[model samples]
Target: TDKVEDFKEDKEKAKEWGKEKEKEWKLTATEKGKMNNFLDNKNDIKTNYKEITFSMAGSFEDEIKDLKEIDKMFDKTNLSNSIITYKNVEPTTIGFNKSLTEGNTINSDAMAQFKEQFLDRDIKFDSYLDTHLTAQQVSSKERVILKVTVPSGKGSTTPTKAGVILNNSEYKMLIDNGYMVHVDKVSKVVKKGVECLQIEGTLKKSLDFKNDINAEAHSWGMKNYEEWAKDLTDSQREALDGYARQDYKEINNYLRNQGGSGNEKLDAQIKNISDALGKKPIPENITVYRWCGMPEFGYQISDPLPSLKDFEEQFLNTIKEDKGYMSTSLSSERLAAFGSRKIILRLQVPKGSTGAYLSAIGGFASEKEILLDKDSKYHIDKVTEVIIKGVKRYVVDATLLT
Candidate 1:
């Protein structure tokens, strides 16, 4: 899929950067498949970038001998066919923010740009990783450049990102070599009419260990509800809210139709409701109620219910002891809409709570529905019996922990 199309709504940014017109710039299916294959088995393609070359050596002042000649030769003249060399002697620090995932190995923004220009059959410095590293050297004398080599073609997107795609052994290899490489920035520069990359960054000796190919790739193309909401215009956000309200009832019905079965539409609708609810504030220090039919068979309420003694001992006690939360639709009023049994919850929100009332954002505003997130926690307080409209109903009172 062309992800760029989704963010074309960022008009000013697109205008400034220029829209991507060439369809050839996007990754090929084979390239994407290669990345997946490499990630799955790191040992399979280790020698893939052996032909690609880059030079690295320390300066004369750093007590590393025989490197002064290479340094002097570089000072003589610029060779049209030469690979850029980096010599590091001093202690250096660098930082970068990026999603270094295996999935991003093929669909990288930087790789696309590189492929459009530098990735050629005749190019000696064929490795995108090598070229990128060479571009990051601030100076041949002062910068603490490491001899870390990443394979060719495995480039990642660089919008707000740095770091190369690497496996556990390669990551640990840097640590064993007493050197670390971190990229801060990668920007395009035209060198002799050819587009090239210029990298900027410091170093990291030790950090969180990520062994998996795409361990850091978790947030590659994802944004939280709040993060996604901030970028939208007022009408766009309102439109999403409208979708949530209109599709709520039918989506739930679809959910109920098949036990634990879900489709893409419901997933999108849930995301919509979640974003809308994220925008709505959670009403604290207030009580909410939910009605359900105490079933003769089992639980999974909302449309169904649990047996009476099982509801009290098995359900409530398990939640209290196991320290888990239950997600269900609740109302502000004691409305007997679904069933005969009543569940009264005292709302008290804690930090990182994801409970919100669907005010003017639900299917029906009069229902005053509140959707609790999957992580919502509660303490089963007590249970009592009550007669409402001459019918006996069992009521359970619980306290919202989060």
Candidate 2:
């Protein structure tokens, strides 16, 4: 149970000018909010130069002293060591074109890279919430011993994302005290043996606030891991579309074969949706999702998506949902933000009806428009729908892996 709609992709720009120990390098941040995000449960800050650390600071000017005051700000389960690496005095305002490190958090892409390709534990600065920060070296002339850090649960393969909960005030404290600096730019230099310079700037950008229902309650977004969440490659899009079209057909076929007290309109609509088979070879903002059965009718796909207009239209006309299930307000990206391997809801559909098929697909997609649509932790379950005239009966099934 994990994670787009068309929104502007994030834009950035980076350089290698730099700051100092006291006059220009202390940090203080001023933004905070509750979070319900996905984690690698596990993760790096992307590095520009192997030898240098590029960063920016908000120049708290010791306005907020005591680095520990900035501590205990984020929802980390625990930490071994923490220190203020730098303080901000004369903060810069540079930008970036293809930078990875942003507002002090680890993202899924880096998380994957951290576990997969980052065999070299070279740079070490993770998460805004850790208790200690420091600098054993005055300049980027020595070997980096500590590995870098970022928010832990950026991108997790497992569905059970760590639910690090915090309120707006508590959340804001982390944002306010920390996250004041950014690695705006990095460059290679050579006063002697291979050296690098990195630009440090004051962070000043607006972050979109989103709602996430990763677990028990209704809430706002925990954090954002840009770039990793935004990029949708063509190959990835086509595969998802192919899955959606094929699955829609099989479900439609099942309904067509069953003799019924037919809702012809619903039936024909199913025919249309079914016929709406296949995706554009060169797909667009395709939606992603997973359903009940696996290895059998495990329908997985990224359907052609609604534009912001479509998103707005759906929201305005949206109706009330049933009581047992909760409507998750996560944007598709934030949907990439959280969930457990558990099947949180059991969708019931009338037997052999085409409407039932479309309802299961489109209806779920509609309700989850803002949230991440796919459930990566799909459980092996039974038939799509069963018939029963509601005196009320239900059952349990689903096995966990690892």
Which candidate number would show the highest lDDT if scored against the true structure?
1
Residue lDDT tens for model 1, 1-402: 111111212435422322222121232455334433433433423232211111111111222221222212212221111112232322211111112212212225634433332221111111122212132323322223333232111232211112222232221101111113334444444333333334433322221111111122123212223344455556545544654546545555554445235477556555555555555344223334445443421434464334454555564423431111123333222333543454433332333456554333333333333455433555553344444444545445444554
Score every model by TM-score.
Answer: 0.32, 0.22
Best by TM-score: 1
Query: How much is 24 displaced in model 2, in angstroms?
Result: 22
Report, for all candidates in order, the number of backbone clashes.
Answer: 5, 52
What range of 10 consecutive residues in model 2 has the weakest lDDT sum? 11-20
Candidate 1 segments exceeding 4 Å error: 1-246, 253-263, 280-283, 295-311, 320-352, 361-363, 374-377
Each model's Cα RMSD: 25.7, 21.0
Which residue pairs in candidate 1 have backbone atoms (N, alpha carbon, C) closer than 3 angstroms, thus clashing? 93-202, 94-202, 94-203, 98-161, 136-199
